């Protein structure tokens, strides 16, 4: 094995060659020199974090003022209209006419004029009614609703006309009947119950400490167990994240069905765990209600755990019996703080008297489930039963509640919904009320798209590493870069998108209560692509949103504290000029409302240049965005004309490129244009951000086993961010790039580590353990894969000796047959350039010396061949591994710190609760 000095000399020579070639061919010096030479065409302006967060908070509060005023208006007029309703029965003569969606033209037929802000056909003349497929059409229980909701369309018209930015307006009733205003055909045996939706549920009840008990007696084993499992699973589905639920089973003794021994939050992971636990249940023993309910009661009074002190409930899943257990209820529940809802599931002939008495005495309700199908309807009922204190609150239940981000029904994007319920309370001066008013007519809601929220968020004046994020008092994120749809509400915690520490949890527990401040901390950050980790200083500025429960914050790496502007060409952005200017891509952003994104990019180029070409004033068009993009295109053209033209063809350099802020890309030769595979949006490509954060050269490895050839003829991507100093103040405008022919690198790698023999291994890796160069001539075919997938022993020993530190993220968005993805990414932790040791699997030992490449992220390892002694502990894989995330059995006993809503309505003295 060669000496350490020889390996150091080889590393120095290789790193000098690579660095020099990348620097000379990419042309960082010329670009930065141009940027520092003009100082005229651009303006550097401060990006005030606290000011921006305040402006965004007030703006979003105003948009919520819009969408709450609309809702109070619609609800008030709904109450007024139904209050003075005849309840016409004989609708034979009075044929009511309405526009039913999802219908067919086989014997209203609107022209269906398509407008912006909606992807599909809309008609503002009429409103569209959605009814569940299972429920029946025109009858004595739907036609009345279809009549008295015919006056809601006027309010819809008025609301839209007074505010043209409204997205959607819906009203949900006790029998479905979603009447949504911008009448659009439905999806295209579709299942959608309006009452079975988070926005319906969150408005129709209060945050509840639900408990579940299941009758698991051996005598009722069979189909009843399956019905119980499916019913309780659908119950858990009904539970939102504002409620705490736990399931226990009792058979002469009560025990937890799962690893949880207390009330846990009803989030997706816990809900799945409870569902799986109940699905694993089996029936054995004799029933004893007393000890079951007792246990449920100290679980209710279990104040040692996290709870929303609000709306305590028991939900018993029984069949029938002759045991009322008066004394058990009397001992624990004398003031009657706990509701008890009991079920009679299955078809049997047991006595149901005590079962009904339990609900009757404890202010709960009793339900029967004779067969599959009635579970969906029966589940909605207890929520409306819980609304009795809420309906009797009067001028206190009038408070809109904003849902979390969830996918819209007609495929519009990420949206949240407002909620308000409608009552029949009327005539306060006489009070013929205190009646049927107990029940609600349903809930009505408006929608705001996350595109609308992000229109209030100007991200393009920041760096790609900066962004916005807002968090609700539960703890999840309302808006985040990593918040991406999968196709169910999307749920990302603040410490589930970013990387966890003590400072981030401290600030997520310091602004979730609704405080403000600033804090700069030194941590490690994550790249756009799930392959690399990085490190940098980020400052977080946060302020509460006074109008709502939300809390927004802003992030700034300490080089995007300032930004760039432009004070106050055509030939550059011409496809026919690509022969000399290179195959340009333009970033499909909202440059102008007149044009649209194309993704095509070629067409987008035609549209962009035809709009820019023709007076060029553009009276209804953006100003700063187009100005910056023009200036940046000028810069890219200047670079290509001055430097890249001089050396038309380099043996080792397959291509060159420069991506910038503004969205202009330049690949010098024509043939390399079709080799370009990445996103034209410069805020979306990973390497842009990675290079800005790393102060060294960044070698992006190509993908391995990717569809279509992209390794041999594409080359190796190298980058280095451009940093400028105007008046001693930092900014990171652009990054440059090169494609390195693999053949040239191979031929120059044979100068030391000669090939065609199996004696020693010479491989060059980067951050993340991706193979870039190898001598074996069979590893060089497979360039671009994770190095642990070919030599896992070496990577594991490298991890143990602490040259590669990894921490795993858990991303909950995946395509699987809502799996959790284990996101492993590696990086250098110990800033030690030299590393040596012996890799021994037993008697056989291999001497290795690993020396890092200076001013890059590459590592060269000089280890013996695998033929000397076989050793493979396990094939270590770095990819999106499908596996269970962190165990919730341990994270519920020390969960994330929550703040609950102070607004609750329960234990009302005026409450009737006759049933
Ligand atoms: C609030 O809603 C209920 C639901 O319809 C109304 O109950 C109806 O009351 C009328 C009174 O004449 C009866 O004719 C109907 O038969 C009732 N409905 C049902 C389903 O039986 C109630 O009247 C409403 N409250 C007010 C103040 O009108
Ligand atoms: C909110 O309401 C006002 C009053 O009509 C309206 O002009 C405004 O555009 C709405 N939206 C926002 C974001 O303020
Ligand atoms: C609803 O019923 C009333 C009778 O109270 C009738 O006059 C009215 O026209 C009906 N509405 C529609 C849309 O026809
Ligand atoms: C990130 O990696 C460091 C070093 O390996 C480790 O100390 C830290 O706990 C990791 N962070 C997370 C959130 O796992
Ligand atoms: C864009 O549309 C034009 C229309 O003629 C077509 O020629 C071109 O190939 C398209 N490019 C892409 C990438 O879709």
Swiss-Prot record:
The modification Phosphoserine is found at residue 93. One of its GO terms (biological process) is cellular response to amyloid-beta. Glycans are attached at residues 66, 147, 280, 304, 424, 431, 537, 546, 600, 705, 748, 800, 807, 830, 843. A divalent metal cation binds at residues 215, 217, 219. Proteolytically processed into subunits alpha-2-1 and delta-1 that are disulfide-linked. A motif (MIDAS-like motif) lies at residues 215-219. One of its GO terms (cellular component) is plasma membrane. It is found in: Membrane; Cell membrane. Its main location: membrane. Keywords: Calcium, Calcium channel, Calcium transport, Cell membrane, Disease variant, Disulfide bond, Epilepsy, Glycoprotein, Intellectual disability, Ion channel, Ion transport, Membrane, Metal-binding, Phosphoprotein, Signal, Transmembrane, Transmembrane helix, Transport, Voltage-gated channel. PROSITE patterns: VWFA (PS50234). InterPro entries: Ca_channel_alpha-2/delta, VDCC_a2/dsu, VWA_N, VWF_A, vWFA_dom_sf. Residues 402-489 form the Cache domain. Isoform 1 is expressed in skeletal muscle. Isoform 2 is expressed in the central nervous system. Isoform 2, isoform 4 and isoform 5 are expressed in neuroblastoma cells. Isoform 3, isoform 4 and isoform 5 are expressed in the aorta. It comes from the Eukaryota. Residues 1-915 are extracellular. Disulfide bonds join 360-904. Belongs to the calcium channel subunit alpha-2/delta family. PANTHER family: VOLTAGE-DEPENDENT CALCIUM CHANNEL SUBUNIT ALPHA-2/DELTA-RELATED, VOLTAGE-DEPENDENT CALCIUM CHANNEL SUBUNIT ALPHA-2_DELTA-1. The MIDAS-like motif in the VWFA domain binds divalent metal cations and is required to promote trafficking of the alpha-1 (CACNA1) subunit to the plasma membrane by an integrin-like switch. The alpha-2/delta subunit of voltage-dependent calcium channels regulates calcium current density and activation/inactivation kinetics of the calcium channel. Plays an important role in excitation-contraction coupling. Binds gabapentin, an antiepileptic drug. It is linked to Developmental and epileptic encephalopathy 110: A form of epileptic encephalopathy, a heterogeneous group of early-onset epilepsies characterized by refractory seizures, neurodevelopmental impairment, and poor prognosis. Development is normal prior to seizure onset, after which cognitive and motor delays become apparent. DEE110 is an autosomal recessive form characterized by profound global developmental delay and hypotonia apparent in infancy followed by onset of seizures in the first months or years of life. Dimer formed of alpha-2-1 and delta-1 chains; disulfide-linked. Voltage-dependent calcium channels are multisubunit complexes, consisting of alpha-1 (CACNA1), alpha-2 (CACNA2D), beta (CACNB) and delta (CACNA2D) subunits in a 1:1:1:1 ratio. This is Voltage-dependent calcium channel subunit alpha-2/delta-1. It comes from Homo sapiens (Human).
């Amino acid at each position: 094995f060669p000496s350490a000095v020889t390996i150091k000399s080889w590393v120095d020579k290789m790193q000098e060659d690579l660095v020099t070639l990348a620097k000379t061919a990419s042309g960082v010096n010329q670009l930065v020199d141009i940027y520092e030479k003009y100082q005229d065409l651009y303006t550097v302006e401060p990006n005030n974090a606290r000011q921006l967060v305040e402006i965004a908070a007030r703006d979003i509060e105003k948009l919520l003022s819009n969408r709450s005023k609309a809702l109070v208006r619609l609800a008030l007029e709904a109450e007024k209209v139904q209050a003075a309703h005849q309840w016409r029965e004989d609708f034979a003569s009075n044929e009511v006419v309405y526009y039913n969606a999802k219908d067919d033209l086989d014997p209203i037929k609107p022209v269906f004029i398509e407008d912006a802000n909606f992807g599909r056909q809309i008609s503002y003349q009429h409103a569209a009614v959605h009814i569940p497929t299972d429920i029946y059409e025109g009858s004595t229980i739907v036609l009345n609703e279809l009549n008295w909701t015919s006056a809601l369309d006027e309010v819809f018209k008025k609301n839209r006309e007074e505010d043209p930015s409204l997205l959607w307006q819906v009203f949900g009733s006790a029998t479905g009947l979603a009447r949504y205003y911008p009448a659009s055909p439905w999806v295209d045996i579709d299942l959608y119950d309006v009452r079975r939706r988070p926005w319906y549920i969150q408005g129709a009840a209060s945050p509840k400490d639900m408990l579940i008990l299941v009758d698991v007696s051996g005598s009722v084993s069979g189909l009843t167990l399956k019905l119980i499992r499916t019913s309780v699973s659908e119950m858990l589905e009904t539970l939102s994240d504002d409620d705490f639920v736990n399931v226990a089973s009792f058979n002469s003794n009560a025990q937890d069905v799962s690893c949880f021994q207390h009330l846990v939050q009803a989030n997706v992971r816990n809900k799945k765990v409870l569902k799986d636990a109940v699905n694993n249940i089996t029936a054995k023993g004799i029933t004893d209600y007393k000890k079951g309910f007792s246990f449920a009661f100290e679980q209710l009074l279990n104040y040692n755990v996290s709870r929303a002190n609000c709306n305590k409930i028991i939900m018993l899943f029984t069949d029938g019996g002759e045991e009322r257990a008066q004394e058990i209820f009397n001992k624990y529940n004398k003031d009657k703080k706990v509701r008890v809802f009991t079920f009679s599931v299955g078809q049997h002939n047991y006595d149901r008297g005590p079962i009904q008495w339990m609900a009757c005495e404890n202010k709960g309700y009793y339900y029967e489930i004779p067969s599959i199908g009635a579970i969906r309807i029966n589940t909605q009922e207890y929520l409306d039963v819980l609304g009795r204190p809420m309906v009797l609150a009067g001028d206190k239940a009038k408070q809109v509640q904003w849902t979390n981000v969830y996918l819209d029904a007609l495929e519009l994007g990420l949206v949240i919904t407002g909620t308000l319920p409608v009552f029949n309370i009327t005539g306060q001066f006489e009070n013929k009320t205190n009646l049927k008013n107990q029940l609600i007519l349903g809930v009505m809601g408006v929608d705001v798209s996350l595109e609308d929220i992000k229109r209030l968020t100007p991200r393009f004046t920041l760096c790609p590493n900066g962004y916005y994020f807002a968090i609700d008092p539960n703890g999840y994120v309302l808006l985040h870069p990593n918040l991406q749809p999968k196709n169910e509400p999307v749920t990302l915690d603040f410490l589930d998108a970013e990387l966890e520490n003590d400072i981030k949890v401290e600030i997520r527990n310091k602004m979730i209560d609704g405080e403000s401040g600033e804090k700069t901390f030194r941590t490690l950050v994550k790249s756009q692509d799930e392959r690399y980790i990085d490190k940098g200083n980020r400052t977080y500025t946060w302020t509460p949103v006074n109008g709502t429960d939300y809390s927004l914050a802003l992030v700034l790496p300490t080089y995007s504290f300032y930004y760039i502007k432009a004070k106050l060409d055509s030939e550059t952005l011409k496809p026919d000029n690509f022969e000399e200017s290179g195959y340009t891509f333009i970033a499909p952003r909202d440059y102008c409302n007149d044009l649209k994104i194309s993704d095509n990019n070629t067409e987008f180029l035609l549209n962009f240049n035809e709009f820019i070409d023709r007076t060029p004033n553009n009276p209804s068009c953006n100003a700063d965005l187009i100005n910056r993009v023009l200036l940046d295109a000028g810069f890219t053209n200047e670079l290509v004309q001055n430097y890249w033209s001089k050396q038309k063809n380099i043996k080792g350099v397959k291509a060159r490129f420069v991506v910038t802020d503004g969205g202009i890309t330049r690949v010098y030769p024509k043939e390399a244009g079709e080799n370009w595979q990445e996103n034209p949006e410069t805020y979306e490509d990973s390497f842009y951000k990675r290079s800005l954060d790393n102060d060294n050269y960044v070698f992006t490895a190509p993908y391995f086993n990717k569809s279509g050839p992209g390794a041999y003829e594409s080359g190796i991507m190298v980058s280095k961010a451009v940093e400028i100093y105007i008046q001693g103040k930092l900014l990171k405008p652009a990054v440059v790039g090169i494609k390195i022919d693999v053949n040239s690198w191979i031929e120059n790698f044979t100068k030391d580590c000669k090939r065609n023999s199996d004696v020693m291994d010479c491989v060059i890796l980067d951050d993340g353990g991706f193979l870039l160069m190898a001598n074996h001539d069979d590893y060089t075919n497979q360039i671009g894969r994770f190095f642990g997938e070919i030599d896992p022993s070496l990577m594991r020993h490298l991890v143990n000796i602490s040259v590669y530190a990894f921490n795993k993220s858990y991303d909950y968005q995946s395509v699987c047959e809502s799996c959790i993805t284990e996101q492993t990414q590696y990086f250098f932790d110990n800033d030690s350039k030299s590393f040596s040791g012996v890799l021994d699997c037993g008697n056989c030992s291999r001497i290795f010396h690993g020396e890092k490449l200076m001013n890059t992220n590459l590592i060269f390892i000089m280890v013996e061949s695998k033929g000397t002694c076989p050793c493979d502990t396990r094939l270590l894989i770095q990819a999106e591994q499908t596996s269970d995330g962190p165990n919730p059995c341990d994270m519920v006993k020390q969960p994330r710190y929550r703040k609950g809503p102070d607004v609750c309505f329960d234990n009302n003295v005026l409450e009737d609760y006759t049933d």
